[PDB]
Amino acid sequence: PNLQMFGHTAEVLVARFDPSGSYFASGGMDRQILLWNVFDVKNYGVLNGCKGAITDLQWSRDSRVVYCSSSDTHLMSWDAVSGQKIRKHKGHAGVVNALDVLKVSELLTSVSDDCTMKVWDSRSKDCIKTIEEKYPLTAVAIAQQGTQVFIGGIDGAIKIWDLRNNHCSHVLKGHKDIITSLAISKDGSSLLSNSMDNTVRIFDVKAQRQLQIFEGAIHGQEHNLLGVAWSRNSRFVGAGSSDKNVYVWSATGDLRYVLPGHEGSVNHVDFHPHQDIILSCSSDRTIFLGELN
Amino acid sequence: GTTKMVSLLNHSLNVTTKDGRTFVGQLLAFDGFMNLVLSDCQEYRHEEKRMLGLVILRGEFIVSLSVQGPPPMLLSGPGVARPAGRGIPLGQAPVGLA
Amino acid sequence: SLCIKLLHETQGHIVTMELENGSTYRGKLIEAEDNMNCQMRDISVTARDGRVSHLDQVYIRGSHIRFLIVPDMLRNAPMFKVGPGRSVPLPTRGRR
Amino acid sequence: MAHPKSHTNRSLLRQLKNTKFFQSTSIDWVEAGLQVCRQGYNMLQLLIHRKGLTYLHLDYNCNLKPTKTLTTKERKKSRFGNAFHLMREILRLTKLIVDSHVQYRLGNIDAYQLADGLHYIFNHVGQLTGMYRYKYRLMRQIRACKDFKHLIYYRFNTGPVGKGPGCGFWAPSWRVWLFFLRGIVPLLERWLG
Amino acid sequence: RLRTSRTKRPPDGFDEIEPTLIEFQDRMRQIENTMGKGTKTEMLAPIFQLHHQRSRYIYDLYYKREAISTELYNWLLKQNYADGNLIAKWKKPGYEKLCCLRCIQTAESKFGSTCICRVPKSKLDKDQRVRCTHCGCNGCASCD
Amino acid sequence: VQPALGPANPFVTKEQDSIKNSITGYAEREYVPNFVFNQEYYANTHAIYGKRNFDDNEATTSTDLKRKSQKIKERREDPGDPSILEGDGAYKGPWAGYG
Amino acid sequence: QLNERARKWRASQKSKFGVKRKQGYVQTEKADLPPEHLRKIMKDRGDMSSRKFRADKRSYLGALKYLPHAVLKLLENMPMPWEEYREVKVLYHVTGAITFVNESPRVIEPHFIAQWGTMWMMMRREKRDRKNFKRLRFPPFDDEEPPFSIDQLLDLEPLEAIRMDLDEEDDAPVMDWFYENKALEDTPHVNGP
RNA sequence: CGUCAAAGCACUUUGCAAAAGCUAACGUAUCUGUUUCUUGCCUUUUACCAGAAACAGCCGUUUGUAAGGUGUGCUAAUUUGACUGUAUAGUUUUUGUAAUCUUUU
């Protein structure tokens, strides 16, 4: 099958599976996160409260608590079993754009239009660290180790920071413009990155040079943050584009699947943790589950 | 105050007394004098045991407190699915341009 | 306070207790107090020695009591919220 | 009495306020009485002329009459219907209630006379407005307003000071005619539509 | 909002303002009662324009020159001499010289929004400067 | 992709060759945020006016906006001010005319 | 070059999320107009004679459907004897095609009883001490005569109306509001407006 | 009154949902219509008389929730909840009758 489920009122942004592979969550401009099943593809809770639009979901690695990143500074927290509020992580003085989580579900990183990175504990309700750069930040990724945090800004310079040192250790180079989504592999050994130059580049974690520049997935005037993912094997790379197409790569530098279906710009493509399924979201208010037999 | 003391409520406790004896069981009720009520109690005089049941201790008699164990023990949103389809667009290029 | 009301509720039943004296007393309880006085009948004392005796009527001082031992059905009894300006727990319809 | 049904609130007068064709403002009552009384005059005139029925003229006191004197062939075209006439005679009433305020804001009348005035109107609507001949139920709203008069007069009038005019305790006699429009409005749209 | 003899008098400062406020009423009747000329949309333009002046007067007397007591300024609004809804916007930045509340309604416009007047002269063309249809705005933008 | 294959019809005039949903051309739904469309539309119009104007009118800038406002601003008549119905002071408002 | 990147970025984020902003535009409340705006339309349109408004005339009949509903809002607002005039609210068709009175009378009940009782005090007293009570003429204005110019009535001044002599010593805690429209709208003795 | 927690607050405009759960005024108010029957006054049908049952409309009311508007504060104010909320060195608990030694198994 394919399954193009409808439900949201307005532009949807982010849609992700549990780490387990038993649910979706989705939510964009609706101010409504809508949970789903995978295997009778039905809705669940209408997580209501966020007074800004959602920009990023992420399941806790317990598969119970959910975290948002509203446009009104809040980062909310939700008990996916019951569906009640837990907290309002009040901090930033602007619009949050990305979130990331660890193994230990306890630490979270967010990224504002205040040019401020901030690490959060799920127990304090306050910031543990505050890394002020200069130009409004956009994408962030934290490693599996719980050590390296990658920041993506407007300079095209993916900076790398550790939790012990807090020094500008390294800076990725050769990306001319804008970053819309970082993504660390299931190894902890390589990033993915969507630039506004349409060069969906991979980078190294440890020597730190490029690997493979992919090219063929356009951003334009919309200025949405488009996403990228690593497949459960780390064989395939799934980048969406404003051309209504989900450009899946071969990770060897070869375009295999280029499946259309959406009527509007695509945002955050994902992969299921085990069985080969693709979550693809788009302003359109629609979502697909593209499979491979 | 007594904010901490309410937190202990319904936990299995180990209570040492001035006599030396140590009572054990859950905590049902608590006081400003530290009168404790305890459920299914067992003294350990010392290789010894006794079964009492419900025990109400005074404040004079109690020395220390210590937890043995922890406390004992949105329907469907609008969304709907559909099947497949995957239409091809005649045009290429981005969404806003043309 | 609730630790006193539970006592008053076991009036009528048979109770065991321990005093600073060292001896334990067992009998039907007739009256209690907020002080922790007691009034019992048909008591069967047992000291440190093991010496049994009979006492027809007894009064006590709470100060002298170490701890009581109460019947089992007295764990399902209600434990109320009380209030700032009330002596006895009781249930409360009014404000709070 | 039924016990009321569960429902969401429709409210017509806040739908019209949500389109770009209606605007809102605050004015004096008697202005907006005249406003209506006029609006209705025209809304009938434009209907009378669109039918090309231009040998009859409505007076400004909602009084319809022929000038020419007609053939039987030219009368059958006139023959306006049970609705239009009911709609008309509901205007004839609105005119009296409003005029009789206009008139007290010249000085002509003075308050105590005006209250009485108002009261006479409701209590006599059978006689000022020849409406009952297009909607015969109406002779129930009439009969009631008469059966208030009796009840009041023989409680107020009598005292030591009873014969003629004065009264002006209209509130009950007024009610009757509101609750009537509650039930007519809905029907009289359907008929006019 | 008509006040008469045998009523509550207004606050002390009022009767200095009296002449000017009558000056407006007198002019306003003169527009109502006269006939227009152009389109029936244009015909009503000089009401809004005048109405804007009556409120600016009072917005001037309380916030800049300071020739009125808070007691009076409030009395003026709750007597409808000046539109508060409007004056509220004059306090907010961006609207510091706005024409008519009707030029800032997204929901009136065929699509989109905002009486062309509301656009800062900078951007739009020489050909489409023209004038608004509602009120006859002409660069209500706070600056241009 | 899978191409068609065959000899290709030789007659085929210009009018037949295009794939048309609705006679003139193919028409399909779009999902562009409106702000992008409004932003896009204005820029295109200026170019069209400019050719008719025959003037490029320089490039859009920062700070020079203030120069462009002032240049427009200076010609425009001074506001009458409140409280003057009459002229010689008078109260031209935003209504005021540049000249 | 980086300074300009962000300037473009921030604006695009501002159109998407933007403090007080709907999908793109800035939403607002439908603010009500000046009173003269409506009053002019009535004068300019007149009797729907001139060609300049030959468009409207289609709508004007369209209104007819909702006339019976305008009558009914108007009468459920009639000003009451003790009031000198009463201000109201309105919906008008920008066409000058109808005026809907958009308030409900709304009143606090023991008070309103009191008032109407106090009428029935004056109204009996006044009937006994008048002698020559001149009841209204009706069809207040003659058939032929065209309706009243609104602008004439705005000059007249209102004239005084019923009420009762409330001595300060005794009726102290009601005298300052026992004859308003929305009594104590400003105090904490009521919600708000 | 006191603590703690949450939240801007009061006032207001629209949208969207609901409103016998254990016999009870969503509205201490109250009007029109349709169908099916029964009787009135009647022969032109409508328009009506005044009872029933079954459906409907209309004029209103309450609540929750979403987005807004005005005034005020976001270096504060207000609301809302929650609570095992009082102060005792002199006899019944928190300013000690404790301290110490020795023998038996």
From Swiss-Prot, chain A:
The keyword Repressor does not apply. Keywords: mRNA processing, mRNA splicing, Nucleus, Repeat, WD repeat. CDD domains: WD40. It is found in: Nucleus. The keyword Signal does not apply. PROSITE patterns: WD_REPEATS_1, WD_REPEATS_2, WD_REPEATS_REGION. Coiled coil: none annotated. Involved in mRNA splicing where it associates with cdc5 and the other cwf proteins as part of the spliceosome. This is Pre-mRNA-splicing factor cwf17. The gene is cwf17.
Swiss-Prot record, chain B:
It is found in: Nucleus; Cytoplasm. GO terms for molecular function: RNA binding; snRNP binding. GO terms for biological process: mRNA 5'-splice site recognition; mRNA cis splicing, via spliceosome; mRNA splicing, via spliceosome. Residues 1-71 form the Sm domain. Its main location: nucleus. The keyword Signal does not apply. One of its GO terms (cellular component) is post-mRNA release spliceosomal complex. Keywords: Cytoplasm, mRNA processing, mRNA splicing, Nucleus, Ribonucleoprotein, RNA-binding, Spliceosome. Residues 74-86 are annotated as: Disordered. It comes from the Eukaryota. Belongs to the snRNP SmB/SmN family. Belongs to the 40S cdc5-associated complex (or cwf complex), a spliceosome sub-complex reminiscent of a late-stage spliceosome composed of the U2, U5 and U6 snRNAs and at least brr2, cdc5, cwf2/prp3, cwf3/syf1, cwf4/syf3, cwf5/ecm2, spp42/cwf6, cwf7/spf27, cwf8, cwf9, cwf10, cwf11, cwf12, prp45/cwf13, cwf14, cwf15, cwf16, cwf17, cwf18, cwf19, cwf20, cwf21, cwf22, cwf23, cwf24, cwf25, cwf26, cyp7/cwf27, cwf28, cwf29/ist3, lea1, msl1, prp5/cwf1, prp10, prp12/sap130, prp17, prp22, sap61, sap62, sap114, sap145, slu7, smb1, smd1, smd3, smf1, smg1 and syf2. Plays a role in pre-mRNA splicing as a core component of the spliceosomal U1, U2, U4 and U5 small nuclear ribonucleoproteins (snRNPs), the building blocks of the spliceosome. This is Small nuclear ribonucleoprotein-associated protein B. The chain holds residues 2 to 118 of 147 of the full protein.
UniProtKB/Swiss-Prot annotation, chain D:
It is found in: Nucleus. It comes from the Eukaryota. Involved in pre-mRNA splicing. May be involved in endoplasmic reticulum-associated protein degradation (ERAD) and required for growth at low and high temperatures. Required for pre-spliceosome formation, which is the first step of pre-mRNA splicing. This protein is associated with snRNP U5. Has a role in branch site-3' splice site selection. Associates with the branch site-3' splice 3'-exon region. Belongs to the 40S cdc5-associated complex (or cwf complex), a spliceosome sub-complex reminiscent of a late-stage spliceosome composed of the U2, U5 and U6 snRNAs and at least brr2, cdc5, cwf2/prp3, cwf3/syf1, cwf4/syf3, cwf5/ecm2, spp42/cwf6, cwf7/spf27, cwf8, cwf9, cwf10, cwf11, cwf12, prp45/cwf13, cwf14, cwf15, cwf16, cwf17, cwf18, cwf19, cwf20, cwf21, cwf22, cwf23, cwf24, cwf25, cwf26, cyp7/cwf27, cwf28, cwf29/ist3, lea1, msl1, prp5/cwf1, prp10, prp12/sap130, prp17, prp22, sap61, sap62, sap114, sap145, slu7, smb1, smd1, smd3, smf1, smg1 and syf2. Interacts with prp1. This is Pre-mRNA-splicing factor spp42. It comes from Schizosaccharomyces pombe (strain 972 / ATCC 24843) (Fission yeast). The lineage of its organism: Eukaryota, Fungi, Dikarya, Ascomycota, Taphrinomycotina. The gene is spp42. The chain holds residues 484 to 676 of 2363 of the full protein.
Curated annotation (Swiss-Prot), chain F:
This is Pre-mRNA-processing factor 17. It is found in: Nucleus. It comes from Schizosaccharomyces pombe (strain 972 / ATCC 24843). Residues 64-79 have a biased composition (Basic and acidic residues). Belongs to the 40S cdc5-associated complex (or cwf complex), a spliceosome sub-complex reminiscent of a late-stage spliceosome composed of the U2, U5 and U6 snRNAs and at least brr2, cdc5, cwf2/prp3, cwf3/syf1, cwf4/syf3, cwf5/ecm2, spp42/cwf6, cwf7/spf27, cwf8, cwf9, cwf10, cwf11, cwf12, prp45/cwf13, cwf14, cwf15, cwf16, cwf17, cwf18, cwf19, cwf20, cwf21, cwf22, cwf23, cwf24, cwf25, cwf26, cyp7/cwf27, cwf28, cwf29/ist3, lea1, msl1, prp5/cwf1, prp10, prp12/sap130, prp17, prp22, sap61, sap62, sap114, sap145, slu7, smb1, smd1, smd3, smf1, smg1 and syf2. It comes from the Eukaryota. Functions in the second step of pre-mRNA splicing. Involved in splicing intron which are longer than 200 nucleotides.
